[PDB]
Design a protein around this ligand. Structure first.
Ligand SMILES: [Mg+2]
Length: 966
């Protein structure tokens, strides 16, 4: 506390704190005749002393402090977010008081003299009080008096007060509690309950106790976001440093606990040097509860009975300190927003310490406390299934903590009702198709957070959701098979689109830091072993592959011999993110577009700044293993030249998102994505359309870009390429990778190139091989540049300069000012000798493929190596073709004429929804030439032709095997 008034314009944001750790500590204080003010060092919040206020009923004391109380607007302008001036203090009751403390604000007040508020005193322990001076009183610029009036209807009493504070606080976070009413309330959990109820039986009680044990097993036998500490010496050293002591007639003394979010009320960056030194003695709750958990784990594993006893007493003393500090039912502590970050490992510690809390008579208090602070999470914790229940962050950060809370419920029948309802809630959350872009699993196996397919969020959710199902397995609380089935689909999908990292195009806002299935490995075992007929051989075989375990190792893990999964082969369509995956030997190709329903990129204030082209019809080739080792190196990476994309090469200042904070740029139409045929062949259709009027986006930049993927190869074609500037700087990237001692070689037309720097220009009939063994045969292009060069770039978070040496090749479209085009072919198993053979086949009247149409309405590609035809209907159209005659919606159709059968697949990659609406099926009428007979696709001969009726739901392809009619 200074001589300056509260909210002094020298620094509005500099808190005035009465902590009493200064010279002449009661200077600013006066009492009426019926109050006595002391310093007591027996408990405190900040510094080592608090104010002991002895009083007769109706008596007052006064703080003499001038307040220049700012408007919310002024507070807000000073801080930079919505703010209010707050009055806050801590008080301790050794005994409950049946009445109210009145806090009054005025000018030159005495016991007998504007606005004020009430604090109910019917509690024991520390409580915090915090009110908006502008918004929570029942204030003119002359206020200099804060009067504390003991209740009138109570003959006498005693209250300890510390850390009386005037500060600027976030206007969201003065919360109402059992002591103080504010304008803000987080209402208490009201648990849903499912009928019929399971009875308390020995069986149902044993199952509850097995689920608790199984949770204990997971936490004592590595968790992300858990700072594990197994050295007892260290746990004891950290504990002693808390300086906790039991006091005589109840409570503790020790270092004050505060959450990472609660500190905001002090404005720590603006504290005077005196206060900050004291504030620096606080303990952050996250660290404290992590310690409580690490102690609980050691206690469980401890074989020495003396060390075990000590670890228990340390845990119970930390629990006692935590409760006495006011982390109890009905104590808001002004706010506990983002509660999970401070408490997740407290929840879990209570499972390990459940019998110790029972014996110490602490279970009910710790249950009431955790349930109270859990009210922040009411939307999930009430356990009523809703459109929002499939939240992937919940599955990651809260789902096990939720179960732990329910398992801590003291009544047996209520605990069974809660866990039964939880089983139903998780089954619904894992089964339902959330409407619009709401979080959760999808029917193509994508898994959405931030309104799109998002591996970075789904991967941790898969791990913990699998673990939950496994914790509940083979009990009356087991998750329904519908939830198990849907999660299997999402997890098998993730195995398909990862190798073992997701491609650049699936990296979300973290390009070059893709999530890895290696982080999800244990979820494959959990889900495998929690099958209705365990183990699921598919999931088990994936677990072994991803974890690098042998067939020999399988019998002990799964209880039967299982061959580790070989890498998946063929083509898989995932229109949930407007992508598809082509797999051949150890390579995966991520083909990715975007549309109205699929954002191109997530770009934040300090993430993915240069990500504009993340989804620009990219076709990133990844062999099994580290992408960095394959030359996907952030440093010096040309963000313009994402593999397979058609882009405008821009300076980074212009490629950078035009929003300083968040942009998730969606496309201009529903249609773009992939389709599949026979699980083996794929096609991408990408309609590249820019917004009419977004800064730095050329409104006339267009392309049509199709890819047909079969076996060891991909045929890439593009048409209708334009920009505002006659295709100046318009380019299609064949590849880009870093040059290293292991990635040092390019082949051009049978010549090894290792020089750095190197440039050349190629055209139709030329080929290359990159250092990753991909061959590129140029089949239509006037100018392809090849470069080995030093590149300067900037990193995607803070735009700081980077540099590196790269091999790349791109088509220069500036040679065709209007409706530029390209064609080229990739071989995934290229060698100089085989690329020589592919080039000869190309010169033999193009033995490789034929483009049957390439215009704004349709792209048609006959692959002569695979004998498959792909049809990208960018617009409904009648066409001339051997198989297909007409399609009445934008669609992707594929055909394969085997011996005596014609296989036809169709889809629209258009998911047919909005951010709000549920996806509904699109009916696609595909007319085919000739008379056919037979899958849920319907067919009807009509004249010399056959009408196929396809139902396209969430961009999920359908196919039908047709045989000819005489
Ligand atoms: Mg103090």
């Amino acid at each position: 506390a200074t001589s300056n008034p509260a909210f002094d314009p020298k620094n509005l944001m500099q808190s005035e704190i009465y902590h009493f750790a200064q010279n002449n500590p009661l200077a600013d204080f006066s009492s009426d005749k019926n109050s006595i003010l002391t310093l007591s060092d027996k408990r405190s919040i900040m510094g080592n002393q608090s104010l002991l206020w002895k009083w007769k009923g109706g008596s007052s004391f006064t703080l003499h402090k001038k307040l220049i109380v700012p408007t919310d607007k002024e507070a807000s302008k000073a801080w930079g977010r919505s703010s209010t001036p707050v009055f806050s203090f801590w008080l301790y009751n050794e005994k409950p008081i049946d009445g109210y403390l009145t806090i009054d604000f005025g000018e030159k007040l005495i016991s007998t003299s504007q606005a004020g508020f009430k604090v109910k005193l019917d509690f024991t322990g520390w409580r915090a009080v915090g009110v908006s001076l502008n918004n929570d009183l029942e204030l003119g610029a002359k206020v200099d008096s804060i009067r504390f009036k003991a209740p009138s209807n109570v003959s006498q009493g005693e209250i300890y007060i510390d850390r009386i504070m005037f500060s600027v606080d976030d206007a969201r976070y003065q919360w109402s509690d059992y002591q103080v009413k504010t304008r803000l309330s987080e209402p208490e959990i009201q648990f849903h309950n499912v009928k019929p109820q399971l009875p308390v039986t020995p069986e149902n009680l044993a199952a509850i106790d097995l689920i608790r044990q199984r949770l204990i097993n997971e936490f004592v036998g590595k968790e992300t976001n858990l700072a594990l500490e197994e050295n007892i010496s260290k746990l004891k050293s950290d504990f002693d440093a808390l300086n906790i002591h039991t006091l005589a007639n109840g409570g503790t003394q020790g270092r004050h606990l505060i959450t990472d979010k609660q500190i905001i009320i002090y404005q720590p960056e603006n504290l005077n040097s005196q206060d900050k030194q004291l504030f620096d003695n606080y303990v952050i709750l996250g660290n404290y509860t992590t310690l409580m958990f690490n102690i609980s784990r050691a206690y469980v594993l401890e074989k020495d009975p003396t060390q075990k006893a000590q670890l228990k007493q340390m845990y119970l003393l930390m629990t006692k300190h935590l409760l006495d500090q006011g982390f109890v039912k009905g104590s808001a502590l002004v706010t506990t927003h983002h509660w999970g970050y401070s408490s997740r490992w407290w929840y879990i510690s209570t499972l390990l310490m459940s019998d110790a809390l029972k014996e110490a008579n602490l279970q009910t208090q710790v249950y009431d406390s955790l349930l109270w602070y859990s009210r922040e999470f009411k939307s999930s914790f009430d356990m009523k299934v809703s459109a929002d229940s499939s939240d992937l962050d919940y599955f990651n950060t809260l789902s096990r903590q939720h179960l732990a809370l329910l398992l801590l419920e003291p009544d047996d029948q209520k605990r069974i009702n809660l866990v039964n309802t939880f089983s139903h809630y998780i089954t619904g959350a894992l089964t339902q198709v959330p409407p619009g872009g709401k979080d959760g699993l999808r029917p193509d196996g994508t898994a959405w957070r931030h309104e799109g397919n998002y591996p970075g969020y789904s991967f941790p959710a898969f791990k913990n959701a699998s673990q939950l199902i496994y914790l509940l397995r083979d009990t009356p609380f087991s998750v329904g098979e519908s939830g198990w089935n849907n999660l299997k689909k999402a997890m098998v999908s993730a195995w398909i689109y990862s190798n073992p990292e997701v491609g650049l195009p699936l990296a979300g806002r973290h390009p070059f830091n893709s999530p890895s299935l290696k982080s999800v490995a244990q979820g494959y075992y959990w889900l495998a072993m929690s099958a209705k007929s365990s183990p699921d051989k598919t999931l088990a075989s994936i677990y072994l592959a991803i974890s690098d375990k042998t067939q020999n190792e399988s019998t002990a893990i799964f209880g039967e011999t299982i061959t580790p999964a070989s890498l998946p082969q063929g083509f898989y369509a995932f229109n949930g993110g407007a992508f598809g995956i082509h797999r051949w030997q150890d390579k995966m190709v991520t083909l990715k577009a975007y549309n109205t329903n699929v954002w191109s990129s997530e770009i934040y204030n300090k993430d993915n700044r240069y990500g504009r082209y993340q989804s620009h019809g990219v076709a990133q080739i990844v062999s099994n293993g580290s992408q960095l080792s394959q030359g996907y190196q952030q440093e010096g990476w040309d963000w313009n030249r994402m593999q397979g994309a058609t882009t405008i090469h821009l300076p980074l200042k212009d490629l950078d998102s035009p929003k300083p904070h968040t942009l998730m740029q969606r496309g201009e139409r529903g249609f773009s994505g992939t389709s599949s045929l026979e699980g083996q062949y794929g096609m991408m259709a990408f309609d590249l359309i820019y917004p009419a009027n977004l800064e730095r986006f050329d409104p006339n930049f267009t392309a049509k870009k199709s890819v047909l993927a079969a076996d060891n190869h991909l045929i890439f074609i593009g048409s209708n390429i334009n920009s505002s500037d006659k295709n100046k700087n318009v380019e299609t990237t064949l590849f880009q990778h870093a040059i290293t001692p292991t990635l040092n070689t390019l082949w051009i037309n049978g010549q090894k190139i290792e020089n750095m720097p190197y440039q050349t220009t190629l055209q139709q009939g030329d080929w290359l091989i990159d250092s990753n063994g991909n061959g590129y045969l140029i089949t239509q292009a006037e100018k392809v540049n090849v470069s080995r060069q030093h590149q300067v770039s900037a990193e995607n978070k803070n735009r700081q300069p980077t540099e590196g040496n790269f091999s790349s090749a791109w088509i220069d479209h500036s040679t065709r000012p209007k409706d530029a085009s390209y064609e080229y072919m990739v071989f995934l198993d290229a060698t100089p000798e085989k690329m020589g053979e592919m080039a000869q086949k190309f010169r033999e009247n193009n033995g490789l493929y034929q483009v049957l149409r390439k215009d704004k309405d349709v792209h048609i590609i006959l692959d002569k190596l695979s004998n498959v035809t792909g049809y990208a209907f960018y617009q409904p159209a009648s066409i001339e073709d051997k198989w297909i005659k007409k399609v009445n919606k934008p669609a992707i159709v594929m055909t394969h004429r085997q011996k005596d059968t014609l296989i036809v697949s169709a889809v629209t990659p258009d998911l047919n929804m909005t951010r709000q609406k549920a996806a509904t099926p699109v009916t696609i009428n595909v007319t085919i030439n000739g008379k056919w007979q037979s899958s849920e696709v319907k067919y009807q001969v009509s004249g010399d032709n056959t009408e196929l009726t396809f139902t396209s739901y969430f961009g999920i392809p359908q196919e039908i095997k047709l045989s000819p009619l005489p």
